[PDB]
Structure formats: structure tokens, C-alpha cells
Amino acid sequence: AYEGEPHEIAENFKKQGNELYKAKRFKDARELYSKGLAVECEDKSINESLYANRAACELELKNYRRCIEDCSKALTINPKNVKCYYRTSKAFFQLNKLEEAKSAATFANQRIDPENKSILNMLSVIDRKEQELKAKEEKQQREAQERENKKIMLESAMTLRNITNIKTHSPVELLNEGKIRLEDPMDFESQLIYPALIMYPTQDEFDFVGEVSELTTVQELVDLVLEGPQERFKKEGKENFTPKKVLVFMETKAGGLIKAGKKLTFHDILKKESPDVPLFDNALKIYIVPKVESEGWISKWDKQKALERRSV
Numbered sequence: 001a002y003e004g005e006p007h008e009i010a011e012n013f014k015k016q017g018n019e020l021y022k023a024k025r026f027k028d029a030r031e032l033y034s035k036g037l038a039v040e041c042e043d044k045s046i047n048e049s050l051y052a053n054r055a056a057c058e059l060e061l062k063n064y065r066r067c068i069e070d071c072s073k074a075l076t077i078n079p080k081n082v083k084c085y086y087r088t089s090k091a092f093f094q095l096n097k098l099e100e101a102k103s104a105a106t107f108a109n110q111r112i113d114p115e116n117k118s119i120l121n122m123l124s125v126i127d128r129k130e131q132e133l134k135a136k137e138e139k140q141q142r143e144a145q146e147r148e149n150k151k152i153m154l155e156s157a158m159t160l161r162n163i164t165n166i167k168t169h170s171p172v173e174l175l176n177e178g179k180i181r182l183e184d185p186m187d188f189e190s191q192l193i194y195p196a197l198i199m200y201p202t203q204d205e206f207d208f209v210g211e212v213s214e215l216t217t218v219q220e221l222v223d224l225v226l227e228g229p230q231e232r233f234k235k236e237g238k239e240n241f242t243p244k245k246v247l248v249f250m251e252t253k254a255g256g257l258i259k260a261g262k263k264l265t266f267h268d269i270l271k272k273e274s275p276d277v278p279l280f281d282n283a284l285k286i287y288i289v290p291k292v293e294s295e296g297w298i299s300k301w302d303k304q305k306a307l308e309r310r311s312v
């Protein structure tokens with residue numbers, strides 16, 4: 001009664017809102033279209049445009065479900081509005097629902113306008129995203145399977161060789177990289193290769209050789225590390241450090257010690273039931289000491305000092 005001609009009031013809000021979509025602030029444009037809808041005039045083309053325009057505002061705002069609903073209401077008035085099918089398709093695409101995106105664009109392509117360029121582009125974009133996700137899936141899943149194949153083959157190898165691995169709370173930073181493998185990583189009968197902490201406790205110095213084959217003997221590893229002239233051994237008894245004059249010792253699972261025989265391989269040492277000589281942090285830990293200082297150093301070995309280096 002205060003004011004009427006609601007069809008022109010609806011077009012007032014419609015034309016007023018279209019200048020704001022050109023102006024780019026969408027939340028104000030969006031609400032201006034809503035008031036044209038609230039008038040509820042008996043006119044199809046006005047209401048169709050209001051629903052299609054508000055859907056466009058919701059797409060720019062990135063409210064994708066609300067965009068689909070305003071497109072649906074526009075298509076109830078005009079089911080051959082190709083603009084609304086593009087927006088439903090793009091909205092579904094952005095929600096990672098590619099089948100719902102393809103269905104809408106396929107309906108527009110097959111049954112409304114095959115020549116429409118925005119619908120064809122959306123088809124090609126849906127097509128690419130479908131198969132790029134496939135290439136991503138069949139890369140992720142093969143690599144997880146390959147990772148798992150390497151891990152089972154390594155555990156089988158270590159269980160077969162009777163190797164116990166006792167982890168410690170404080171490994172020095174060279175060990176924490178973690179380098180243990182098979183030569184043929186799919187054949188668990190090929191050589192297991194592990195790193196080695198070589199301890200010289202009398203001098204307070206250590207070597208870290210990154211890769212030692214299991215079939216390597218104790219003598220051969222001792223020959224390699226002591227070959228060069230030692231700049232390192234400043235403390236007492238430096239002259240005794242030669243392959244002929246040193247002895248090699250290793251920690252047991254109980255916490256004590258065993259003299260590692262120079263003829264023996266690391267394979268045969270780790271495999272033995274008694275005494276059980278394990279790895280520490282997936283690596284060897286040997287103690288090279290002079291032959292003359294071994295008697296005093298073995299007595300010094302504290303059993304609980306070593307027992308409480310361990311994690312659990």
C-alpha cells in the first residue's frame with residue numbers, strides 16, 4: 001500500500017546489483033539480489049536472473065553448496081540456462097566431487113548447447129584432474145608397496161640371521177641417520193650391510209665407518225681403520241695401536257663383554273645363540289683396546305653402566 005509495482009521493484013534491485021558485480025564487491029551485490037527475491041513477483045525472467053546472479057556471487061565468495069542451490073532454483077524456472085550448469089559444475093569441481101561436476105557439464109553439452117565453450121573447457125578440466133589424480137594415486141600406492149617390500153625383506157633377513165637390535169636413548173649423531181640394507185634388497189640371501197661404531201675407549205676417540213659387509217672379518221675391519229697414521233691418539237699407549245697388538249671387544253645382551261675373535265665374521269658373531277651379541281641402533285659397536293691394557297679395562301667394565309644406556 002505504501003508502494004507497489006513489485007515487478008519494477010524487483011528489476012530495481014536487479015539492475016542495481018549488476019553494477020556491483022562489475023564493481024567487484026560481491027557480498028553487497030549478493031544481498032541486493034536477495035531483496036529482489038523477497039518481493040516474490042509473478043515474473044519468470046526477473047526471478048531466473050536474480051537466482052542465476054546470486055549463484056554467481058556465491059561462487060566468487062566460494063560458498064559452493066549455496067551456489068548449487070541458487071543454480072537449482074534458476075533451473076526450475078529455466079532448465080535450458082547454460083550459465084547455471086557451468087556454475088554447478090565448477091562448484092562441484094571445487095568441492096572435489098568430479099562425478100557430480102561431470103554429470104552437470106555433460107547434460108549441458110549433450111542436451112542444451114554442444115557449441116558452448118565454457119562447458120567444453122570444464123569437461124577438459126574435469127578430464128585432466130581425473131587422470132592427474134590417477135597418476136598421483138598409482139605413484140603413492142606403488143611407493144608405499146615398494147617401501148613395505150623393502151621393510152619385510154629386511155626383517156626376514158635379520159630374523160633369519162638371528163640378529164637382535166637393542167635401541168639406546170643417546171646415540172651420537174652419526175648413528176641416527178640409519179643405514180642398514182641388503183646388497184640385493186629383494187633377495188634376503190645376499191649380503192646384509194650395516195654401519196659400525198669403532199670405539200677406542202683408552203684414548204676417548206671413535207671412528208664411524210658407514211658400510212661394513214657382514215661377511216667381513218674382525219681382522220679385516222681392524223686392518224682398515226688402523227692403517228693410516230693416527231693423528232688422533234694423544235693419550236697414553238698410542239704406539240700399541242696396530243692390528244697385531246690390539247684386541248676387539250663387544251657388548252652382550254646381558255650387559256657384559258665378549259672378546260670378538262679376529263678370524264670370525266660379523267655374521268657368525270651376531271648369529272650365535274650363546275653368547276648373544278646384538279647390534280645397537282641398527283649398527284655394530286666394537287671396542288678396540290691394546291693387548292697390554294685389556295686386563296685392567298675388562299675389570300673396569302661396569303655392567304649396569306651399559307644396561308642403563310639402553311631405551312627399555
Ligand SMILES: [Mg+2]
Pocket residue numbers: 162163164269270271272273275276277278
Ligand atoms: Mg645372536
